[PDB]
Design a binder for this molecule. Structure first.
Ligand SMILES: O=CCCCC[C@@H]1SC[C@@H]2NC(=O)N[C@@H]21
Ligand SMILES: O=CCCCC[C@@H]1SC[C@@H]2NC(=O)N[C@@H]21
Lengths: 41, 671, 671
């Protein structure tokens, strides 16, 4: 029997928060940098 | 003109309706769709489908340029506009003609001439059709206003030209009281609105919305198709339509249609038209307007005549003559149509958007027609009309048709959003509606009975709900057993058996606000003995599947019944021809997340709409019930009110901003 | 006479047709079959079935003794001959009568009297029906030949009695040129054939093959069923039939039938008969012949009258009177019939034998009737007729019926052999055919319009083909995943995903002789970006199954369409109502057998046929295009030609030998 309901992790982040906006911008730049370097390789 | 390919410049049920007839005739079908309609039933139904841009109809289905461009690119010879959107647009019908595309509808001249009330009345009066009506007057002389009040008779209502909410409004029962009531109304209007202009509108009575289906051709020959009663309306929205109209004699209707037919010949109207009449309690009728399109309620006419009006529209737009003579047309039986709206009748018939999580439907027979443009899992859209489906029935007698519709409505099941179905069940069972005593004020007059509160459930219903829960657990056990190597172990049974004693289970179910304690005993024979309070019930049943719907067959204390069972989230839905009952399964606290978050922010926008007014500064002390903002959505005013007595920390929107649904409007200081 | 059991002395669609009506009436059905028909649909459809010997019809379906023996052994009271075989055999109908078996057809006298043209014309002329015709003359006096030319009326054609290929044929436009042209034709005929006998056959006008369905009874009462246009014929073979014949007035047809009816009463014809007329451009008609059987094209008559002609044949053969009076018979709508042949129109309508690897069919409705005696996987036989099925439609208007047939033909799919379906689509869409301007020379006159070359495919079609191939690979991956223990591994997905880059696949597809390079990029969202040359397309779709046919639902650059997808061998078949496209998948060289046998020992016999001529000795030097042998197959002459300039090593066959299909005819010396 696997029908038991259970709790789940995670919470919705505050997309409007300045910290979230800054963190997203910085991480996105790193990912874009990673992608274009692989393209050259 | 050979119409081998048609573009349908519409969506939803009417697009599917047109495509069904086009395909029956061997005509190729072209759909158009917005980004929001990419997966709609009419897109999948067409032979070709083209994107016309984003979800807002002004940028998609109302974009004449895009529709003409798709008609050219698909090489469609004809455009069927359906109903609404571009169907009554004169510029679009002229543009189709300029581009050599057949508009399947009336000529641009007939659309124009009927689109202006004063023009349409003047043409109708000249054609013999009666022009009488009650209307407001823009002249403001006391003598002129008094002469007009006399013309429309007494009693009359004086109202202010500006403003709402009953301010500056006066009933005048006789000519002697007119002057005093006019001066009273003017003083109140001047005080409230700085305007003393008064209006004088008061038709003696407007009891019946009786309308005639008329059909014309390019040749100019014109025919009528009896009449339809659309008197049962809420805020001028038609709710139940019935053809033929009850209590109108065949002779009277024949005369009624003939006067309308002469007007139809006068404008040489081509394609289907509807002459709307106001009918009094003496069956005198007067022309109201002419809708220059196929009506929504055309299926009740089709069911009583055996005609396909869309098929006739395609043939006549191709240039063929009317298929049957007036002598050939015959009437058999009576028919009814109810419109399924995504509305909450208990909340003043507010439109509701959301998913169709369950959309079971009555089985369709020639008498029962489901005009559905939506399928289970479809989401109703804020951009488009809220109608879910239209149900029409034909019967030998009108009373039998009413019985069939009510049985059918019970079989229709809609879960995921509020609907008007229970309101339609109350309305179709109202004694005055059964008698055929209908008029345009029927819903306002009977509002008290047509809307009613929930009543406590019977103990038998609770027993059935508990049985359904137990059987669902048994089904889950069988599902687990399917994947196990030990397929036949006695442990996989759902007997709930014990050694030398009987297992009694304490279950709790919530009916409304009441918690019901049920003691269920698992019997050796497979039945269940349920005790609720001081009463004991012997319950036995099983689950069987018809189509995609699970059915519960149960017997309580020897009484056998069948019902449709759906268990979604923590609610048990039981659908039976007697009625529908919802039972709530209590949610354990530990799983309740045990995380209450007070009330951050203020009321979320009821929907996506422009902010029209802001009543709160960046730092303002407010008390519960203090209006914070006013928002207009699809032309419906909502005023946001203060949830708490806390001072306002900040405001997220300013006036003129468009706020998306459920977005925070105000920030309140933490206390 | 109580007919409770009927033997059907036929095969294929007509046997199934008769059995359907017999079973509807509660009559038991007996099939006969050859060894080649053991698994045929009519064998499985019958209540009993009996072997009548080997595949050649002369030793099976034409063996009167075997058919009578089976009728006796099965205790069948009646024999239904169907059409062809023994249906017009007088000796067989008399043998049935001698043996006390009911022949379901005309009496042996009517079969005889109609089987000889001179006898039939003399009876028809005596019955009032017109006898005029253009005929050849066996007298060879210059005066006699000239008198006959005048009676026929100029222009006339002089031809030699012996020989073919236009030799000895002179056209004569007037009486003054007759002598010179006759002497010219005689000198050429004497030089070419050693015979100076000339024929004199000309017909100034023979435009229409209009025929009347007539029904008679043992009582002698006779009725007609309007008329059918069979003018669209290739080599006299009827291709498209229609009822009623266009442009013939109801009054004219009534007169046309009445003159035929008098002849039918004159021979007291019992059972269905057809009076074939030649009709001129002025609608004057003359008797041509009477077919003493059910016609192949009887379904177009049934669709316009609502009658079952086989049901009437069974009732009348039992002795009952005609069911409906001439007054009772009424005509509604118009109907069309197209003969689906296993023929190659591009190769001069050569018959083709082979497997029905795919045989998808249009869904059948009362208007759409599929008269099919074959099922998917059935093999067309060299011994029997090449027809695959017959498609008939009924509509309110003739133009609508033509539209329905063309839409339906597209839904019909036949893979494994060549068919006339694309020729029927071109013919049914020809402007003169749409106008109803038909005559017996229509196909010869419009040959160029009706037969056309392949055109290069659009880039969207190539994108759809690539999408279908990718989806087939995905389906194969899912099939493999089904049998694996690691059911949910991400590797089982068909995402084609890479880390920090996008996967681009270089695919090559062949359209005709052109190789097309497609660069497919697997997007994260599941769509595909395809670049062909300088154009980029956004492609997304999926595979869904309707019945047994896989369908591809795709959208290219926002344009959505549905098509039937079949991937057989290295060809991708895409069937859409727009059309059908075939795309070839290149075959890797390694898989292709390297160094396949190169030498081919002479052209292989086109089919199994007698060798009529041998032009090569055991050792003879030949050049490409040198005729080696002449073979006759089913009365069709084929001349084998030298493939190479090599000297002939040996000959495997001599004159009069029967050579099986694809058997080596000549051996060439190795060089
Ligand atoms: O704008 C959309 C349609 C409903 C509102 C239009 C208002 S009704 C009062 C005024 N008179 C008109 O003819 N139009 C506007
Ligand atoms: O033999 C089978 C039927 C077709 C060929 C028969 C030929 S046609 C010329 C000659 N005249 C006849 O009546 N029969 C043969």
């Amino acid at each position: 029997y696997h029908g038991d309901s259970v709790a789940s992790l995670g919470t919705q982040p505050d997309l409007g928060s300045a910290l979230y906006q800054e963190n997203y911008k910085q991480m996105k730049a790193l990912v874009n940098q990673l992608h274009e370097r692989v393209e050259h390789i | 003109r050979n119409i081998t390919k048609v573009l349908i410049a519409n969506r939803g049920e009417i697009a599917c309706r047109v495509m069904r007839t086009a395909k029956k005739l061997g005509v190729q079908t072209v759909a158009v769709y917005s980004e929001a309609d990419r997966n709609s039933m009419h897109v999948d139904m067409a032979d070709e489908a083209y994107s016309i841009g984003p979800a807002p109809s002004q940028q998609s289905y109302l974009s004449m340029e895009k529709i003409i461009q798709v008609a050219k690119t698909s090489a469609a010879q004809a455009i069927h506009p359906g109903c609404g959107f571009l169907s009554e647009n004169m510029e679009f019908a002229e543009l189709c003609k300029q581009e050599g595309i057949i508009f399947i509808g009336p000529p641009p001249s007939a659309i124009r001439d009927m689109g202006i009330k004063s023009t349409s009345k003047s043409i109708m009066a000249a054609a013999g059709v009666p022009v009488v009506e009650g209307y407001h007057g823009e002249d403001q002389s006391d003598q002129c206003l008094k002469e007009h009040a006399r013309r429309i008779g007494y009693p009359v209502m004086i109202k202010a030209v500006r403003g709402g909410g009953g301010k500056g409004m006066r009933i005048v029962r006789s000519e002697q009281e007119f002057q005093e009531q006019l001066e009273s109304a003017r003083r109140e209007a001047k005080k409230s609105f700085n305007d003393d202009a008064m209006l004088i509108e008061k038709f003696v009575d407007t009891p019946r919305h009786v309308e005639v289906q008329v059909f014309g051709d390019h040749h100019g020959n014109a025919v009528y198709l009896f009449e339809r009663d659309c008197s049962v309306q809420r805020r001028h929205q038609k709710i139940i339509e019935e053809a033929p109209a009850p209590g109108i004699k065949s002779e009277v209707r024949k005369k009624l249609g003939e006067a309308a037919v002469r007007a139809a010949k006068a404008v040489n109207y081509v394609g289907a038209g509807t002459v709307e009449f106001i009918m009094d309690s003496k069956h005198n009728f007067c022309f109201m307007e002419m809708n220059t399109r196929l009506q929504v309620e055309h299926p009740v006419t089709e069911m009583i005549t055996g005609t396909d009006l869309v098929e006739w529209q395609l043939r006549i737009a191709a240039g063929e003559k009317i298929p049957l003579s007036q002598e050939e047309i015959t009437l058999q039986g009576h028919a009814f149509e109810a419109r399924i709206y995504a509305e909450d009748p208990s909340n003043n018939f507010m439109p509701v958007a959301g998913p169709l999580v369950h959309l079971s439907t009555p089985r369709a027979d020639p008498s029962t027609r489901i005009e559905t443009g939506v399928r289970q899992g479809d989401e109703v859209s804020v951009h488009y009309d809220p109608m879910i489906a239209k149900l029409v029935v034909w019967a030998a007698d009108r009373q039998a048709a009413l019985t069939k519709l009510r049985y059918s409505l019970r079989q229709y099941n809609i879960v995921g959003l509020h609907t008007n179905i229970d309101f339609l069940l109350n309305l179709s069972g109202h004694p005055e509606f059964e008698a055929g005593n209908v008029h345009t004020d029927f819903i306002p007059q009977h509002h008290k009975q047509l809307l009613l509160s929930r009543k406590a459930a019977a103990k038998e219903s609770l027993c059935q709900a508990a049985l359904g829960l137990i059987l669902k657990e048994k089904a889950m056990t069988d599902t687990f057993t399917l994947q196990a190597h030990d397929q036949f172990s006695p442990f996989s049974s759902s007997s709930g058996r014990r050694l030398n004693i009987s297992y009694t289970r304490n279950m709790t179910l919530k009916d409304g606000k009441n918690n019901v304690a049920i003691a269920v005993t698992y019997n050796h024979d497979g039945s269940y003995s349920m005790q609720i309070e001081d009463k004991t019930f012997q319950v036995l049943g099983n689950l069987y599947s018809e189509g995609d719907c699970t059915y519960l067959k149960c017997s309580v204390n020897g009484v056998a019944s069948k019902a449709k069972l759906i268990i979604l989230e923590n609610t048990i839905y039981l659908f039976s021809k007697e009625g529908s009952i919802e039972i709530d399964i209590p949610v354990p606290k530990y799983l309740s997340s045990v995380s209450s978050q007070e009330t951050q922010g203020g009321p979320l926008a009821p929907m996506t709409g422009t902010i029209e007014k802001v009543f709160v500064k960046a730092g303002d002390k407010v008390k519960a019930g203090d209006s914070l903002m006013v928002m207009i959505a699809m032309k419906m005013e909502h005023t946001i009110k203060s949830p708490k007595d806390g001072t306002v920390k900040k405001v997220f929107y300013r006036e003129g901003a468009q706020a998306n649904r459920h977005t925070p409007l105000v920030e309140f200081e933490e206390e």
